[PDB]
């Protein structure tokens, strides 16, 4: 089953142009100087002006398609893999297809939704399509605008969130190329759904039924209970992941590339590994939801110089609660 | 690539218990007697009392798991494939996992979102997971509560929509079993996104930003423009689908099993094929969004007596605009 041929052929990013400095937010909203860096690990973030999520996704996608040495017309499947929707109907796949100028192309455009970790699950889904020879050149797009949900009365909210899009084009490797997935794993603990959720935005508490409460559209988080899920299930998760690739260990991997919605995951990793092994984007882009992991993947290659033949580990914990992990040769 | 081993091992359904007769709606809201049947093709529908979407999905799933001769603990991947969300965070996968009593199981639970046609795309995704030997016993759940979005001032709305859930367990076939997919195709024409959309419920028009209009939470449909997309692209879609299985034609298939959000698809099919070839559920369950196709699949097997070794065709047009088609041996 594993080693699965798989090539990240191209990578792309779009971020809004204007830097919002933590220092300026602190001055504006009477927070102590240095508060965002100390408490959140965030020095800067980017917020949209008039961009739509599909716009940002399409900009990232075009970069990834160029990076792969391809034209837009060569893409044969589009997977939207964002942490939040642009609108209720259609899903983000057709919307980014349209934004790319491919609206009359017929190219199937769908959404994979694992909340947080949609990009990860989309890579997995794409790997299977590729190895089954169903499609050859798959675009995965993760674009999130969180700045819409900002609450400027709560510092733990309005200093945490940023906007970003990142994209990948994935293909089978060419003959002789080592690019592959050595291990991949997804586990879900839905008992933790209530500890990180947004109860509004669907049929359960529809804008006006009989089950609506005042706080329906904001994130309800119980950090202590989320950690307990980690305590109980993460060690067995990690054991099972690395058992898939017994000939490869963390020592053989150049970068750990985490979903990073807060500084906690980076702090944990920083106690364990040298700083140079960890790919950090939260410091400059904040919590960008579903774009976090692919932003970090973009960073690993385009700033960290990850070379073909070197190995990386994708890792993340997301709402649902789900855990993901993938060991790959780039 | 095609014939792909694939077995629909079990099927399940949940519908609310109380029948809402078109005749009673006509009396209540001063419509002419027989209006729903003539205009919509709908004699009855079911509307929830206090059920959640996850509840209905879990009820359907349990039936499907029993039908497959399995226990819930045997399922190794859950795919939520509904036409609408229960809430914004997490996605419906973890929520149905929790509802099933599998919240501490670790079983990956995700969402595939192709609007309308999510069930179809989930079958495809599942087929690839199965044939890549990644998972063995995959649960696909489609549960939709549309009755929340009813507008009792617009007859074309409040008489059209029903609530339902349906589910399938899919596996590889046992040795000697003929169950397979002969052909599968998905095409998307995102230029048609604007002709069937809900502009609210996301980042584009977030409950209060600067881009909200009065009509954001209702379906904007342009039926004439939707048909033009069919005129232009459906004939080539169908040609390309049947070219995948040159040794099998529509004459070799016992049932056509359509996504049926309105009477138009059934009217088209009824002009072409004998009535007994068409599987109809809209008459008793109305437009149940993402549950429509799997409701019809449940009907084909559990009422229409589709036998192992007989062939069927899944077909549908959905918001995005996307078209889907699959030819299979049951």
UniProtKB/TrEMBL annotation, chains A, B:
Ranges for domain Beta-ketoacyl-[acyl-carrier-protein] synthase III C-terminal: 248-329
GO terms, biological process: fatty acid biosynthetic process; secondary metabolite biosynthetic process
Top-rank lineage group of the source organism: Bacteria
InterPro entries xrefs: ACP_syn_III_C, ACP_syn_III_N, Thiolase-like
Recorded GO MF terms: 3-oxoacyl-[acyl-carrier-protein] synthase activity
Modified residues (Cysteine sulfinic acid (-SO2H)): 116
Assigned keywords, A-Z: Acyltransferase, Transferase
SUPFAM superfamilies found in the cross-reference section: Thiolase-like
Pfam families per record: ACP_syn_III, ACP_syn_III_C
Domain Beta-ketoacyl-[acyl-carrier-protein] synthase III N-terminal stretches: 112-188
Listed name of the protein: 3-oxoacyl-(Acyl-carrier-protein) synthase III
């Amino acid at each position: 089953v594993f080693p699965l041929p798989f090539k990240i052929a191209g990578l792309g990013r779009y971020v809004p142009a204007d830097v919002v400095l933590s220092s300026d937010l602190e001055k504006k909203y009477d927070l102590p100087p240095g508060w965002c860096v100390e408490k959140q690990g965030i020095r800067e973030r980017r917020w949209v002006k008039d961009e739509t999520a599909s716009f940002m996704g399409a900009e990232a996608a075009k970069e990834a398609v160029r990076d792969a040495g391809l034209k837009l017309e060569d893409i044969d499947l589009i997977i939207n893999a964002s942490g939040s929707p642009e609108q209720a109907v259609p899903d983000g796949g057709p919307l980014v297809q349209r934004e790319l100028g491919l609206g009359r192309s017929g190219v199937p455009s769908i959404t994979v939704n694992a909340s947080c970790l949609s990009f990860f699950v989309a890579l997995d889904v794409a790997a299977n399509y590729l190895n089954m020879r169903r499609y050859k050149r798959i675009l995965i797009v993760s674009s999130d605008i969180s700045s819409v949900a900002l609450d400027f009365r709560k510092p733990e909210n309005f200093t945490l969130f940023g906007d970003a899009a990142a994209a990948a084009v994935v293909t089978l490797p060419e003959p002789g190329e080592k690019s592959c997935i050595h291990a991949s794993q997804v586990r879900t603990y839905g008992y933790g759904a209530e500890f990180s959720m947004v109860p509004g935005g669907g049929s359960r508490r529809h804008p006006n039924g009989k089950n609506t409460t005042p706080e329906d559209n904001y994130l309800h988080m119980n950090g202590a209970e989320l950690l307990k899920i980690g305590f109980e299930y993460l060690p067995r998760f990690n054991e099972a992941l690395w058992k898939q690739c017994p000939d490869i260990t963390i020592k053989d991997c150049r970068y750990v590339i985490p979903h990073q919605p807060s500084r906690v995951v980076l702090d944990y990793l920083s106690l364990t590994y040298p700083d140079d092994k960890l790919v950090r984007i939260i410091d400059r882009f904040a919590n960008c939801i579903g774009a976090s992991m692919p932003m970090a993947l973009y960073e690993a290659v385009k700033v960290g110089g990850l070379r073909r033949g070197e190995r990386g580990v994708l890792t993340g914990t997301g709402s649902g609660v789900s855990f993901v992990g993938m060991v790959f040769t780039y």
